[PDB]
Amino acid sequence: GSSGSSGTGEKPYKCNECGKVFRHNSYLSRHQRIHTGEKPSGPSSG
Ligand SMILES: [Zn+2]
């Protein structure tokens, strides 16, 4: 799971939820999606 307070990769774009690394942000943002998604707790955006 989340084993590592701070991770350093060879790419400027790396996921924190899983840890995987990507080349472009687009792929990162779209990917992170698989993580996000849950009941609304606090008002962030609307
Ligand atoms: Zn991820």
Swiss-Prot record:
Zinc finger (C2H2-type): 13-35
Name recorded for this polypeptide: Zinc finger protein 347
Function: May be involved in transcriptional regulation.
Record family assignment: Belongs to the krueppel C2H2-type zinc-finger protein family.
Species in which this protein is naturally found: Homo sapiens (Human)
Span within the parent record: 592 to 624 of 839
Subcellular location: Nucleus
